[PDB]
């Protein structure tokens with residue numbers, strides 16, 4: 001029910017101390033070395049995270065998505081790449097297996113994930129099939145008591161580091177999106193090979209790369225859901241993840257704001273600190289309102305999912321609005337640091353580069369607009 | 379009346395200086411009460427430390443020589459002091475607030491069932507009521523409270539080392555030697571000392587450091603920092619520095635202080651040749667005590683220093699070393 | 710093997726500053742936390758729970774808010790929590806405090822009792838050994854490592870110059886130090902259930918064994934006569950000579966107490 005309960009307070013207290021002590025002083029080392037944070041994954045796992053909103057019987061912690069989203073928010077507040085490693089793991093990889101996988105499947109794949117012993121990833125986007133998701137070109141065909149997989153997925157978060165991949169492929173092209181099926185694919189199988197980790201603008205710690213399937217043989221027992229269900233499985237999976245990313249934006253926005261408030265008080269120009277000029281205040285005001293506004297939209301989506309009310313539109317309003325809010329606020333943030341903001345000794349610029357992707361992936365802000373307007377026009 | 383008793387501390391048969399300071403304050407408290415001053419000496423072969431105590435103001439020297447006191451272990455010391463204090467009946471008992479003092483006193487005052495004030499910094503007996511006003515700093519140091527022990531005797535306190543001032547050693551005065559016998563049996567020797575190992579002072583991070591000697595651009599070279607590390611040794615704190623020095627290759631980033639290094643709030647900060655941009659000042663503005671050396675009296679750092687010295691680094695620093703190295707050579 | 714840890718919820722007095730433009734100390738914003746020596750002890754106990762199979766119980770004296778301390782401790786790995794609240798304790802000094810806590814321990818099965826060296830708000834570092842005296846147990850302070858072998862505890866005792874390697878037959882009280890270990894984080898889910906189910910025991914005076922004339926101010930030998938706030942730092946002097954200069958430095962240092 002209520003979100004100012006001491007329970008959640010106590011989670012937030014945990015998250016903040018983990019963030020400041022374990023994540024914050026790695027942030028830019030991962031930006032500059034463009035390196036995956038293996039250490040803060042295993043550290044993260046140990047303190048419970050990596051399975052926050054899954055039943056204990058499957059190796060998760062017994063939490064709710066609100067306490068999970070709280071975690072993504074409080075991580076991206078200090079380091080955006082780390083935020084996505086989690087949100088991608090819990091929302092994109094773990095959840096479809098939790099929701100659509102049977103009992104054998106939830107025991108062999110869902111438990112290693114929820115316990116933090118392994119790392120999860122979701123592969124849907126292809127070079128010729130991005131926002132138009134149904135133009136999948138990777139094929140799955142059933143041969144004996146194995147499936148054979150051929151094709152490529154580009155831009156997949158938590159590629160190389162990840163252990164379990166929830167990939168989508170056409171099993172009947174001649175039915176469109178009623179022809180996609182979803183498969184659980186373990187890193188190590190013959191034929192499953194990786195790309196080169198991409199060079200990107202800001203989320204440089206997150207390992208993003210290509211999945212390559214060359215006559216890749218898979219047990220038929222790895223089909224997640226029914227044949228042809230994959231489209232709907234991926235669609236509903238993204239509804240959840242949009243919440244994670246919206247909170248990622250939120251984290252970023254709130255961290256960038258927290259940093260400027262620190263600075264604008266220390267820095268004196270013209271005899272008085274920067275915080276004493278009407279424009280820096282009014283800008284801070286406009287920023288805090290956008291962040292607060294966004295907070296409400298993010299968690300109302302979460303709340304909806306936990307109560308099992310429908311949540312896909314709610315999640316899209318949170319993705320659109322926090323993504324924009326992240327971008328505006330980080331930008332105003334660097335501005336307010338002045339020259340020093342533009343240097344990489346301070347973190348605000350990295351937050352600004354981090355922010356931009358929150359308008360793009362897990363569905364672009366245009367896709368969100370398509371969603372919101374669609375449930376409005378009938 | 380009673381007497382004013384100071385519990386002496388010795389480590390491998392040398393008196394700790396805080397003891398002799400405490401005998402200092404002891405002669406004042408005792409003179410304000412019209413009573414004399416007593417010393418509790420505890421150890422194994424502690425003979426001769428006695429004459430020292432006499433010289434530093436002690437009038438009675440209560441002595442407990444036993445090989446159970448050879449090495450400090452809480453209980454033999456507690457039992458001994460209880461017996462000896464209970465026997466003298468002091469108006470006031472002072473321990474030095476050390477790792478021994480702050481371990482031994484609370485246990486003694488409990489067994490007596492009196493009251494104890496810890497880590498004190500000021501003592502004096504009120505004109506009216508003649509109680510010992512014991513003032514100690516609390517609440518992480520942001521508070522100064524004055525506590526009294528209304529009814530129970532002896533009035534007890536652990537006192538901060540370095541705060542009370544000693545007496546002038548008088549080689550003529552001998553004192554009375556009390557030669558107090560104490561038995562020590564099994565229910566007291568319960569803690570057994572397997573090994574006494576002495577290791578070194580354990581380098582610490584600058585964020586945690588107590589004193590910082592901080593290098594600026596002013597020093598002018600990497601080996602020129604040795605003179606700082608030399609001084610850093612004599613005060614115990616570590617060396618930190620401005621981004622200037624780190625950039626120039628003189629120190630690890632781990633020693634950088636300021637908006638993009640480390641924020642440090644130590645008890646002392648010595649700025650050696652730092653101009654003090656806001657990038658640096660907002661790193662250490664909150665230190666308890668800041669001392670700065672610069673050639674430029676228009677340096678902005680002086681705008682923050684509690685003691686702004688204007689001089690050459692390479693001529694102040696060695697003079698500060700010579701003055702202090704004779705300081706702890708003599709005392 | 711039974712381990713009882715005495716944690717005290719304190720306001721974090723590192724984060725206290727005095728506002729120069731009001732004079733007093735900054736009132737709010739200071740979070741309440743497990744005093745750190747105490748969190749450290751709690752760490753050493755849960756370490757023992759994981760290695761030897763011990764049973765960690767945790768107790769705190771204070772007002773209802775100190776519940777949060779026990780819940781933090783529980784989610785870190787403790788098994789039991791006791792919050793001890795009573796009007797009776799109002800004004801307690803370290804005698805009337807150690808005796809209160811001692812009287813509870815009369816009713817809590819123990820083999821090791823762990824407390825922190827110093828509570829960062831009263832700053833006396835006196836309750837640990839006074840509790841041990843009341844209960845007539847051997848005590849070890851300034852603890853830098855804790856190991857057990859069978860019926861005995863092995864402890865390293867930290868000193869100014871040396872450090873002792875010690876051995877005691879259980880029972881015993883140990884005061885633990887803020888560094889010495891690095892305290893593990895809570896587990897989610899441990900937080901979720903510590904709040905969703907809530908096994909935390911709240912004891913009143915009825916639940917302890919004490920002479921009530923040993924509780925609270927009326928039971929406290931020492932008492933607070935006057936107490937005043939820290940003086941705001943002064944102006945600061947800027948000086949021009951030489952080698953009289955280092956004397957400039959050292960006589961102001963002697964003033965703030967480092968005469969060595």
Ligand SMILES: Cc1cc2nc3c(=O)[nH]c(=O)nc-3n(C[C@H](O)[C@H](O)[C@H](O)COP(=O)(O)OP(=O)(O)OC[C@H]3O[C@@H](n4cnc5c(N)ncnc54)[C@H](O)[C@@H]3O)c2cc1C
Pocket residue numbers: 088122123124125129130131132154155156157158200203208357360361362363364365366367
């Ligand atoms: C760092 C990173 C990590 C990623 N991780 C993953 C991952 O783990 N898993 C995964 O499945 N995918 C992942 N992706 C893919 C990402 O979700 C896609 O980039 C996103 O869906 C947009 O698709 P696209 O790049 O092909 O853009 P395109 O579809 O080429 O679209 C580009 C632009 O055209 C606009 N546009 C497209 N179609 C329309 C239309 N009909 N009407 C109006 N405007 C339109 C879009 O809104 C956008 O501005 C990742 C991408 C990046 C950059």
Ligand SMILES: Cc1cc2nc3c(=O)[nH]c(=O)nc-3n(C[C@H](O)[C@H](O)[C@H](O)COP(=O)(O)OP(=O)(O)OC[C@H]3O[C@@H](n4cnc5c(N)ncnc54)[C@H](O)[C@@H]3O)c2cc1C
Pocket residue numbers: 340343345346593594595596597619620621622623634635636637638639640651652653654655656657658661671672673674677689690691692
């Ligand atoms: C993005 C960014 C981040 C930064 N972050 C930090 C940071 O975290 N920390 C930091 O410290 N700086 C930082 N800076 C730099 C900061 O602004 C200054 O450059 C820094 O204060 C330079 O160090 P300094 O005072 O030692 O050197 P200078 O300012 O060059 O001052 C040297 C001083 O030494 C004096 N002097 C020289 N020789 C002698 C002598 N023999 N005897 C006495 N006095 C002498 C001179 O009068 C002068 O006052 C940052 C800058 C940027 C752009």
Ligand SMILES: Cc1cc2nc3c(=O)[nH]c(=O)nc-3n(C[C@H](O)[C@H](O)[C@H](O)COP(=O)(O)OP(=O)(O)OC[C@H]3O[C@@H](n4cnc5c(N)ncnc54)[C@H](O)[C@@H]3O)c2cc1C
Pocket residue numbers: 494495496514516517521523525715716717718744746747768769770771801802803804806810823824825826827828829830831832833834835836837931933936
């Ligand atoms: C300004 C001020 C000055 C004071 N001066 C004195 C004085 O000189 N002498 C004196 O006897 N009293 C004094 N008191 C009273 C004293 O602070 C309280 O009695 C307090 O209960 C015990 O002191 P402490 O908080 O310093 O604890 P400490 O003795 O520092 O704590 C020792 C350990 O005991 C345990 N512990 C302590 N309190 C609790 C608790 N409430 N619940 C659970 N475990 C606990 C913890 O493990 C802690 O690490 C003073 C109080 C104030 C406000």
Ligand SMILES: CC(C)(COP(=O)(O)OP(=O)(O)OC[C@H]1O[C@@H](n2cnc3c(N)ncnc32)[C@H](O)[C@@H]1OP(=O)(O)O)[C@@H](O)C(=O)NCCC(=O)NCCSS
Pocket residue numbers: 124125130131132133134238361362363364367378
């Ligand atoms: C899904 C996809 C590929 C296109 O297919 P889709 O959006 O499902 O379109 P349809 O289902 O065919 O259209 C639905 C129709 O059913 C109609 N309908 C509903 N109920 C009806 C009823 N009882 N009787 C008659 N008609 C009805 C609707 O009116 C609607 O018609 P309109 O076009 O006039 O609105 C694309 O639109 C999309 O949204 N992709 C999102 C991908 C994403 O987020 N990718 C990021 C992954 S990266 S980590």
Ligand SMILES: [Ca+2]
Pocket residue numbers: none
């Ligand atoms: Ca490296």
Ligand SMILES: [Ca+2]
Pocket residue numbers: 457565566
């Ligand atoms: Ca005894």
